[PDB]
Design a protein around this ligand. Structure first.
Ligand SMILES: O=C[C@H](O)CO
Ligand SMILES: O=C[C@H](O)CO
Ligand SMILES: O=C[C@H](O)CO
Lengths: 231, 231, 231, 72
């Protein structure tokens, strides 16, 4: 039985800035392969770095001030109102520092997912804003790759039985082994699982949509291909 | 007697953001079974978390300030026009904190219902906005599953009698036991209740719509199937 | 004398939101019986509740400020302008609080009438807007139930006489006792009034439409049934 | 032609505007001051205007229905 379907990325992510600034450098090759956590951009941190240290300097100061006044109050050598204020400043500083630290950190735009980055919608030297509508770039995990198959609700059950009645070659719980046949006609060398758990149902058609998962190193398979799963 | 009908989810909910931000992680398998209250997404909280603590710091401060002026007014050491401004700030802080707390909490996009989530209409790293038109995802309770049956108003009464005149196998108050027959032809193994209380009436047809309730573990039954209840 | 007619709800009401937000919970069973004033939905109030208290805090503050300046102005200790601005703020806050309170109240979507709610056109987690076109649900009082009867203007007088000339069994002022006969053929066990005051007239036909009122506990009778009143 | 003439000038006013807008961005994109996305939008409008004006001009011209052939 041949099931028609479309190939889709296994996982997709968007790269976006979360701090305001100028793109200093774009550390990745358009179209290359990147790893989740890998620095993809560098926003000029000259300032954030400066504010962050400017801050810590402050905290170090107010903190000393506080820790000391608390000693004085204990001898009644300073009104508790003086202390309260001292500790007040200390807490604000401590807050400032944390926010500074957070912003500096957001300075190195990292990749959320592991996959294939494409073109960089943002040029070096460009101005980038936190919250900005457009994404700097998009990564896609193309290795294990999906094949969305759509069968009428009935057939999905028919197959589900055969899977349980051993009439279908097991591949795992709720999964039967399957082969792929490109619209080319050719036979994709490798083979993969065909999970039976439903992903979506067009109630207007009643038809269900399940996913097949094929290994795709070499990146032979790409999203959008009209293929055929085989059982 | 065989009553035609369609299978429908037992309950449906939508997943939506209620805070602005970037989708950090999508904690769920498209097509899986999720529980109500289960975290479905994580919106980056670096800041909301910072603000929230920045606030609490403040409240901790003003609160002390206030409480002290409260005891001080008695000795007339602190006026009443002070303990007023003081208590003013205290109340504002307390409010800021609650608002901070609320936003942080929305940072974890939980699932409203227990059911089956399908595809995630939002990619990781994407930008999400409170009030946004589109829903991030949709959960559907499919275990007990409904079967909407439509009979002409007359028939509904005829059956209602037999139910009371013992001529129909009781299943509970106003419910008669029923079996399901898929459009496949097969006989759904389990059987369930056919509640007689009306759910809706197409006055333009006069016909009524009642619901059958079948157990559906194993998830064999899906919404949209054209079935037949049997009595 | 058998008068043909259609059964109709005794009263209809629509459930709609009057505040913006997300449907947290839908507290009612589709197809059940609900009482006027009963909470049907809960719109996530996390924020409205927060704004309301955020407001009250503010009012508490400005109000003190005002009452104090009202003092200083009366002692030429401060200009009338200062007292003016202070009172200005006070008045704004007081307005803010009232609006907050109103919105919070709308957070609980109560049922306007007592009757029978059907399906909920809105899912939990859904986005709901004040002013939105569609109604979240519809309650229909079905106990006393109407039976719209249509007779030629002439016949309505004929009967009206007999009613006054004792030739018809009184049921109340302008009402004659009547029995119902379902299109089933059967005899509805209970009986009710047949009010003679006209409700509408198809001037294009000259025919009048009057209503019969039958008790309908057990909910045996439903809107849309083609029946027959008997005199 | 009262209107065609009005639309035509209504248009030309527009183009004169958007054209200035564009020519100005044309330089800020070179000095990475304006996002290549924006300059795109500016030049987009400019091209639309220029298109509108041509159509306006064409219609105004037709305000004078001429004879295709020489004859009777
Ligand atoms: O983001 C992937 C491609 O480069 C563009 O659209
Ligand atoms: O929402 C259900 C499916 O995942 C999509 O369309
Ligand atoms: O709203 C009345 C019925 O429940 C549905 O359509």
């Amino acid at each position: 039985t041949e099931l028609p379907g479309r190939t889709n990325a296994f996982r997709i992510a968007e790269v976006r800035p979360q701090v305001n600034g100028i793109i200093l450098k774009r550390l990745f090759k358009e179209g290359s392969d990147v790893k989740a956590g890998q620095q993809l951009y560098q926003i000029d941190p000259a300032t954030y770095e400066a504010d962050y240290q400017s801050a810590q300097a402050n905290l170090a100061s107010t903190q000393e001030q506080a820790q000391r006044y608390k000693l004085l109050v204990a001898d009644q050598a300073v009104s508790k109102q003086q202390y309260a204020d001292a500790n007040a400043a200390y807490l604000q500083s401590k807050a400032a520092v944390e926010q500074a630290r957070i912003n500096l950190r957001y300075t190195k735009v990292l990749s959320p997912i592991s996959g294939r980055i494409g073109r960089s919608a943002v040029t070096e030297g460009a101005l980038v804003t936190n919250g900005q509508a457009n994404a700097m770039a998009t990564v896609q995990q193309l290795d294990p790759i999906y094949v969305d198959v759509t069968q009428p609700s009935t057939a999905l059950l028919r197959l589900r039985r055969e899977l349980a009645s051993g009439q279908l070659e097991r591949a795992g719980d709720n999964a039967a082994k399957v082969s792929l046949k490109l619209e080319d006609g050719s036979q994709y060398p490798l083979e993969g699982r065909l999970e039976f758990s439903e992903v979506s149902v067009d109630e207007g058609t009643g038809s269900v949509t399940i996913r097949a998962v094929f290994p795709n190193p070499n990146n032979e398979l790409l999203p959008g291909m009209f293929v055929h799963a085989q059982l």
